[PDB]
Design a protein around this ligand. Structure first.
Ligand SMILES: *[C@@H]1O[C@H](CO)[C@@H](O)[C@H](O)[C@H]1NC(C)=O
Ligand SMILES: [Fe+3]
Ligand SMILES: [N]
Ligand SMILES: [N]
Ligand SMILES: [Pt+2]
Length: 670
């Protein structure tokens, strides 16, 4: 049978669960999911139980979601509770540090300030902040209450041991652990700040808005960002300590019933959810309060499948709660863990590693998205991306550091490549203005030159991104294998239409090969045709060609030889870039520039010697067209770097794209 064993942690909870089971039997057909009710002693027991394969699901607070993630439990989030609006789910909240305007300090300057806490042991008001500040705490850090009283000059920490550590109760003597204390709770801690008792108050993103009606008043207040800037209170989503999931159903990583769990809970909310007016409410029980699910919930969203536990909690959270749980502190820039896609990339990376003598290390992952995810959650530090991946890496909170440069260095804005529409000279009927029902070749989908620029522009002409209806057939590696845009792809087995090496029509060169062999139009960079014509490319497919046989398509409507790319382009392309985490801009920016003048475009004969912009077999780690790694100056946002023109386009293209890492990242940041 298709049963979901639900874990209760109390007698009251089991009773509800039983009702849940029973009422489900009225509504669900026997060709549908069941509830079995498993009572355990605690949330930890439940976690073990699921891991043990004695239960299937339980709903956890964020701290516990973390514990469940850890081996030997290896549970993951599968369904999220949402609150209030359907349009706007209240899935996550943000822990913020709120300060007075012009109080004149940053996150890294909190030592000897007056802090306001919502209460000891609360996440937003304690666990998170103190978790992040853990390594700044004076030794010994046990007891933690002591080391915190020795950090801040004085504070209000409700439920703190004021008897032993008076500096914790200095703003609220006795440390009222109830609402008799004025400085207790969400509104409480915020009051502590407003009443000018404390310099900073650790609260939810929403506390500030619930305790100050008029915008005029809210302008007196800023947020401390972790990058040690401040920001208005309205920009809590870019300036927070952590992003915390409210209530999460969790399953086994592999062999869970994610699918079945969702099916059950979905049908469940359908018939018994908010205002379904039945005898059984899913978010209410006469037995108690918050049984199985928060009573305040409005329903469930399915957690996107790409989402592991670490990615769901976020880097900040994991960091803080890890420090709390482990309690391990270490200095300048350690090794930079670089992310390698392939076995051949890994090989080039091992060379780079041992040459810097430890100053570079190599983590490797299967796909690019696998690599981004590793940078995100700090298993890896940096890698080089296409502009279209930079977009994604950005939407996931990674930032660009250094652009790859092709032209002759260090300081150069622009310097980007050209998106070009390459045709065969002979068919003179082809124009940019009328490419409908033509065969087409893309580098991959979601790539700058191959997809983002060309299809971006083309969208402004058809007003949809369903391009496999516009073009007759084509090859656009990374499409749905059943799409007409996988018809031309030359990949064999499960490699057909796959955006990797094992698809011959993948990338700049591959899309051109496609054009040559099968397509009517290829979307590639300007440098592509020259490099793979006139005997330069020694492969049979490319050997005996010459660029005179090929032409570009210009926006106005005309054509021009492969040389007039100067003004026969589609648009200028955001250069390929190096992405990392906000908290590594400094580290990466430094160690790379230093690894550049050692092994860059100022030592030749890259045989026995090491070069950074040389590859054994095609562009490994960095392109081969690369000469130097540029400073970005202002442009270290994925918006600022790509430009709003690129972004507006990719925004439109998103309506159709299939990226699962993007899907997960925009679950947290809609
Ligand atoms: C490449 O750099 C040179 C340096 O002066 C510049 O003249 C040239 O225009 C650049 N690239 C282009 C757009 O041709
Ligand atoms: Fe590119
Ligand atoms: N597994
Ligand atoms: N597993
Ligand atoms: Pt497994």
């Amino acid at each position: 049978d298709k049963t979901v064993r639900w874990c209760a942690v109390s007698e009251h909870e089991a009773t509800k669960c039983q009702s849940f089971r029973d009422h489900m039997k009225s509504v669900i057909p026997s060709d549908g999911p069941s509830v079995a009710c498993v009572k355990k002693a605690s949330y930890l027991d439940c976690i073990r139980a699921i891991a043990a394969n004695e239960a299937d699901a339980v709903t956890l607070d964020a701290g516990l979601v973390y514990d469940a993630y850890l081996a030997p439990n290896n549970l993951k989030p599968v369904v999220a509770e949402f609150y209030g609006s359907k349009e706007d789910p209240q899935t996550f909240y943000y822990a913020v540090a709120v300060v007075k305007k012009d109080s004149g300090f940053q996150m890294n300057q909190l030592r000897g300030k007056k802090s306001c806490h919502t209460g000891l042991g609360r996440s937003a008001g304690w666990n998170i902040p103190i978790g992040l500040l853990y390594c700044d705490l004076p030794e010994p850090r046990k007891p933690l209450e002591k080391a915190v009283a020795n950090f801040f000059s004085g504070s209000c920490a409700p439920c703190a041991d004021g008897t032993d550590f008076p500096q914790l109760c200095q703003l609220c003597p006795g440390c009222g652990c109830s609402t008799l204390n004025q400085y207790f709770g969400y509104s409480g801690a915020f009051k502590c700040l407003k009443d000018g008792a404390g310099d900073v108050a650790f609260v939810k993103h929403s506390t500030i808005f619930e305790n100050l009606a008029n915008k005029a008043d809210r302008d007196q207040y800023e947020l401390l960002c972790l990058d040690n800037t401040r920001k208005p209170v309205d920009e809590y989503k870019d300036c927070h300590l952590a992003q915390v999931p409210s209530h999460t159903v969790v399953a086994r990583s592999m062999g869970g019933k994610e699918d079945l769990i969702w099916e059950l809970l979905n049908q469940a909310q359908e018939h018994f959810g908010k205002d379904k007016s039945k005898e059984f409410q899913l978010f209410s029980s006469p037995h108690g309060k918050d049984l199985l699910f928060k009573d305040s919930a409005h329903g469930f969203l399915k957690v996107p499948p790409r989402m592991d536990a670490k990615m769901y909690l976020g880097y900040e959270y994991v960091t803080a709660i890890r420090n709390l749980r482990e309690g391990t502190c270490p200095d300048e820039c350690k090794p930079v863990k670089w992310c390698a896609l392939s076995h051949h990339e890994r090989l080039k990376c091992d060379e780079w590693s041992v040459n810097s003598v430890g100053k570079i290390e190599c983590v490797s992952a299967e796909t690019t998205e696998d690599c981004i995810a590793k940078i995100m959650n700090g298993e890896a530090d940096a890698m080089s991306l296409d502009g279209g991946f930079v977009y994604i890496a950005g939407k996931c909170g990674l930032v660009p550091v250094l652009a790859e440069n092709y032209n002759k260095c260090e300081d150069t804005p622009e310097a980007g490549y050209f998106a070009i529409a390459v045709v065969k000279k002979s068919a003179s009927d082809l124009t940019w203005d009328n490419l409908k029902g033509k065969k087409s070749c893309h580098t991959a989908v979601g790539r700058t030159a191959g997809w983002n620029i060309p299809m971006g522009l083309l969208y402004n002409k058809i007003n949809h991104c369903r391009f496999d209806e516009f073009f007759s057939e084509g090859c656009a590696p990374g499409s749905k294998k059943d799409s007409s845009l996988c018809k031309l792809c030359m990949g064999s087995g499960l490699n057909l239409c796959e955006p990797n090496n094992k698809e011959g029509y993948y990338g700049y060169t591959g899309a051109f090969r496609c054009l040559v062999e099968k397509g009517d139009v290829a979307f590639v960079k300007h440098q592509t045709v020259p490099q793979n014509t006139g005997g330069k490319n020694p492969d049979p497919w490319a050997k005996n060609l010459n660029e005179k046989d090929y032409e570009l398509l210009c926006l106005d409507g005309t054509r021009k030889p492969v040389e007039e790319y100067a003004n026969c382009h589609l648009a200028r392309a955001p250069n390929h870039a190096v992405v990392t985490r906000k908290d590594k801009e400094a580290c990466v920016h430094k160690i790379l520039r230093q690894q550049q003048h050692l092994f860059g475009s100022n030592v030749t004969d890259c045989s026995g010697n090491f070069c950074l912009f040389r590859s054994e077999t095609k562009d490994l780690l960095f392109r081969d067209d690369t000469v130097c790694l540029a400073k970005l100056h202002d442009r270290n946002t994925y918006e600022k770097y790509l430009g709003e023109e690129y972004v507006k386009a990719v925004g439109n293209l998103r309506k159709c794209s299939t990226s699962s890492l993007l899907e997960a990242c925009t679950f947290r940041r809609p």
